[PDB]
Amino acid sequence: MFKPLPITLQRGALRLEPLVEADIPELVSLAEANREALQYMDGPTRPDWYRQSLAEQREGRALPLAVRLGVQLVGTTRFAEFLPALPACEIGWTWLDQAQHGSGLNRMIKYLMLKHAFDNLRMVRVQLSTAASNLRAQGAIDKLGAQREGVLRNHRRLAGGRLDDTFVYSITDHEWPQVKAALEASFTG
Amino acid sequence: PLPITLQRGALRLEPLVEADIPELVSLAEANREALQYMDGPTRPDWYRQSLAEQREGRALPLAVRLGVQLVGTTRFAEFLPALPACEIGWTWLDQAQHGSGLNRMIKYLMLKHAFDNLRMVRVQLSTAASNLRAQGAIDKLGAQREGVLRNHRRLAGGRLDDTFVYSITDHEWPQVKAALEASF
């Protein structure tokens, strides 16, 4: 019996709050201005993508989050692919407005969600995955301390519809205390 | 995903229906011993769960018949419609078919349907890291190990275990098909 509940996470001006329908126009618009950075995820420029993340939430298959800095929307991320009997999930489907590319915002987001996943939901496993072609995301997930677990062939389509492989990484609950220590050792006080 | 009938001589795979569940549960209870894991074949809700996913477009569970006789079940699940891709698994057969090769011909029929009818680019298979038997059967299919997912499943007694994930791409399918055919 695992049922995910809505969560807001904060640190300073950074707030992760449950995605609602009233956010979709602004997020779609911001994603479109970030079209070229989104070449490795197919969906964030279409309104349907956010409606389907809300549908999955309605069946308790996801907790999609809007990312705000102060008042302004800045992007999205989600917990998803719940394995309720473990419990396990996946974190990803993240994008940020290019004004935040390289400020440690992405790493702070993964930290907040990882901590919530392991410390509060007692996940035994958090999966992270990305396109085989998305080298930047592979390096950021490695620096998280996740371990690559495999490469799934012909497993996703990029923005043009080209077939790509998927790199799959995970953190287990027993290694999380070490991962957590190293992540918080990396944050500016 | 849509209902469908796959056949090969006496072997027939057809969509699972609620009316088959009593006989399948009963037949698995006669094979209780031979089912360490999985958890499922003795539980009617395990079958109804798969029927429910089918109404949501997420699984295609099949009754396995030899002639008119129900001998087991198997399914397609984990659909990725944009690729398209899926997983085949959740197979069990009563012990009269143990070591008879029916398992591999079932996989042959299912893999044919996924690649040659549905034109999938990826068929996934997986098993517990502790299930050495199922690993050897998957190897002999020619499926290539792709990943080891840690803490990815609970075994029948509840303990955490890793999952070995394998796949067959569409380009490997010709050779997989020929090697399956040669072994019949």
Author numbering:
A (entry chain A): 7 to 195
B (entry chain C): 10 to 193
What did the article's authors report about this structure?
GCN5-related N-acetyltransferase (GNAT) toxin, with an acetyltransferase activity-dependent mechanism of translation inhibition, represents a relatively new and expanding family of type II TA toxins. We here describe a group of GNAT-Xre TA modules widely distributed among Pseudomonas species. Notably, other than arresting translation through acetylating aminoacyl-tRNAs, PacT can directly bind to Fur, a key ferric uptake regulator, to attenuate its DNA-binding affinity and thus permit the expression of downstream iron-acquisition-related genes. Previously studies on GNAT-RHH TA family also observed pronounced growth arrest after expression of the GNAT-type toxin and co-expression of its upstream antitoxin gene counteracted the toxic effect. It has been also demonstrated that the translational repression function of GNAT-type toxin depend on its acetyltransferase activity which transfers the acetyl group from acetyl coenzyme A (AcCoA) to the amine group of aa-tRNAs, subsequently resulting in the inhibition of translation.
In this study, we focused on a hypothetical P. aeruginosa TA pair pa3269/pa3270 that encodes a putative toxin PA3270 containing a GCN5-related N-acetyltransferase (GNAT) domain and a conserved acetyl-CoA-binding motif. This toxin has been hereafter referred to as PacT (Pseudomonas acetyltransferase toxin). The apo-form PacT exhibits a typical GNAT family fold consisting with a central, eight mixed β sheets which besieged by two or three α helices on each side. However, PacT exhibited low homology with GNAT-RHH toxins and the cognate antitoxin PacA bears a HTH (helix-turn-helix)-XRE (xenobiotic response element) motif; thus, PacTA was classified as a GNAT-Xre TA system. GNAT–RHH toxins, including E. coli AtaT and ItaT and S. Typhimurium TacT, have previously been reported to inhibit translation by acetylating charged tRNAs. These experimentally verified GNAT–RHH toxins only share 23.1%–25.53% identities with PacT, although all of them exhibit a conserved GNAT-fold and contain a unique motif (T/L-X-L/V/I-X5-G/K-X-G-L/F/W) for acetyl-coenzyme A binding. Taken together, these results confirmed that the PacT belongs to GNAT family and the PacTA constitutes a typical type II TA pair. According to the results, PacT directly bound to Fur. Next, we identified the interacting domain by using the truncated form Fur1-83 and found that this N-terminal DNA-binding domain could sufficiently mediate the Fur–PacT interaction. PacT can directly target the N-terminal HTH domain of Fur through protein–protein interactions without acetylation modification, but the binding of PacT obviously decreased the DNA-binding ability of Fur. Under iron starvation, the significantly increased PacT not only leads to overall translation inhibition and subsequent bacterial adaptation but also stimulates the iron uptake process by directly inhibiting the DNA-binding affinity of the negative iron acquisition regulator Fur.
